[PDB]
Amino acid sequence: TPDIRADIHAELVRLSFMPTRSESERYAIADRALAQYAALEILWHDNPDRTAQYQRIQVDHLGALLTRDRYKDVISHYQRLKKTGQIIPPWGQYWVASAYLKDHQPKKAQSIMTELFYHKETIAPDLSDEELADLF
Amino acid sequence: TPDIRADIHAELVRLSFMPTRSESERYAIADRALAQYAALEILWHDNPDRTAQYQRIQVDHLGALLTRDRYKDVISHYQRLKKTGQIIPPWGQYWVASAYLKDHQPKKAQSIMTELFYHKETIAPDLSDEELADLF
Amino acid sequence: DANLTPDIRADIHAELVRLSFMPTRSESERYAIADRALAQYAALEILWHDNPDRTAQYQRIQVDHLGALLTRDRYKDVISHYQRLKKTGQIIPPWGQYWVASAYLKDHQPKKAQSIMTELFYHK
Amino acid sequence: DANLTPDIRADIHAELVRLSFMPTRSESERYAIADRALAQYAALEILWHDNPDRTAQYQRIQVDHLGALLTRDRYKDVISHYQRLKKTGQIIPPWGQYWVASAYLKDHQPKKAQSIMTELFYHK
Ligand SMILES: [Cl-]
Ligand SMILES: [Cl-]
Ligand SMILES: [Mg+2]
Ligand SMILES: [Mg+2]
Ligand SMILES: [Mg+2]
């Protein structure tokens, strides 16, 4: 049930990115999601049993804020999510880049896109647990 | 002055890693640092003007906890530092690995050492700010 | 033991493509390293085309090739190669989609670049 | 334009060493790719030794060589190469120190491995 409430929030945020929709309509659907959010924020804040779908709406919230052209809020919500050590999925980083750009702040948008597309190669000497141990 | 107080804390934590020193002595010097910490934690908690040297003692604290063989506390302090989105320097990760290992939990120690030694290569199409913009 | 050598040859192709994206480097240097990879490709293209035992290695270089084309500013070729790889129904990894978007954009074709980036971040 | 080719040859050496550390791979595969790099090295060793214009590229392969030796389980050689590179006063990057520690450890010499790791995390 909390899953489907987060699912509904997510759907609304996605419906907000319709270019088929005008500014009036976009803004109105962004609001339906901003509101569903405000409610669930409060309902779920102090609850370890709803920790999962809390984190989801936290990110989907970046979409709604951006859709309603509240650029500085997307950044401040991002920065607030950062300081909870929560991992922003890539699509969430796409949103905050868009925002950083529209706030006349492109260098930050670039650094986000850079950190999104790299290649990583380990240099881990295959060590046994007993060999890693003999190192401490 | 806060710099030199953090400097003193750091020095104590380093003096705790002397193998030249016995268990009694090690434990005693770990305590001098655990205490200096407890004080500075409180003195500095709600202070944006001391945010820098706060973060330093936060990490140096992992050393003292580990030196006094309080393995589970090093992990719980680490995990608490994680959820503040604070960046643990490599030497701090070395400490928490040692702890994860001594808590009979080696797979986590390995994953830390792995994430410490990699190679990273960007795949960033060099895009202009005006071209990154034309993408949003 | 038999996929080891071709694996490393595809691995070296990939590395060259990635070395071409180092922004520290000028146009002449970029172009030179892009060429080393465009060439490694042209060779392996021929060596492998009709070979089921290197079908995996073939497909890798096919995508890594998008990078080299883009790095050497051959935008229109990146798109034609993309569209050709699309019609073989093989997956373009995300980094590959980012590449073809950059190309679509530099070919003065931005609405199609957005459409690519849309499909690139889809989680439903 | 003249450091470009030697740069890419050192770059390819490095990549091979790194491909050797992929833990997905068996002993036979690891050993085979370690050899491709040990060989690339032996060639460049000779080609470059007495050449001030490739002194940079020379020094790179010198460190990357620690990886290949270690990957092929030639522990005692990693240490002797380390100690030889040490006496030329050139910096071993951190990842290089991690390598020689692993070697010192596998040569049943753990107290020296700790001493290396000590110097590896020093910030005072
Ligand atoms: Cl082509
Ligand atoms: Cl040798
Ligand atoms: Mg690489
Ligand atoms: Mg690649
Ligand atoms: Mg390397």
Numbering used by the authors:
A (entry chain AAA), B (entry chain AAA): 224 to 359
C (entry chain BBB), D (entry chain BBB): 220 to 343
Paper text:
Cellulose, alginate, the Pel polysaccharide, and poly-β(1,6)-N-acetylglucosamine (PNAG) are each produced by the synthase-dependent pathway. PgaA contains an N-terminal domain with 8 predicted TPR motifs and a C-terminal porin domain, while PgaB is an outer-membrane lipoprotein with an N-terminal de-acetylase (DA) domain and C-terminal glycoside hydrolase (GH) domain. Previous studies have established that PgaA and PgaB form a complex at the outer membrane and that the TPR domain of PgaA is critical for this interaction. Our results suggest a scaffolding role for the TPR domain that combines PNAG/dPNAG translocation with the modulation of its chemical structure by PgaB.
After attempting multiple truncated constructs of the TPR domain (PgaA-32-465, 32–448, 32–431, 32–415, 32–398, 32–382), we found PgaA-32-367 to be the most stable and amenable to crystallization. Diffraction quality crystals were obtained, and the structure was solved using selenomethionine incorporation and the single wavelength anomalous diffraction (SAD) method and refined against a 2.85 Å native dataset. The asymmetric unit contains two molecules (chains A and B), which were modeled from residues 224–359 and 220–343, respectively. There was no remaining unexplained electron density suggesting that the original construct had further fragmented and that only the C-terminal fragment containing residues 220–359 had crystallized. As there is no evidence that PgaA forms a dimer in solution, we presume this domain swap is a crystallization artifact and that only residues 220–342 represent a biologically relevant fold. The structure of PgaA 220–342 is all α-helical and contains TPR-3 and TPR-4, as well as an unusually long α/α-motif containing 46 amino acids that likely represents α/α-5 based on our bioinformatics analysis. Combined, these results suggest that dPNAG binds to the conserved groove on the concave TPR surface of residues 220–367 and that W314 and W318 are involved in this interaction.
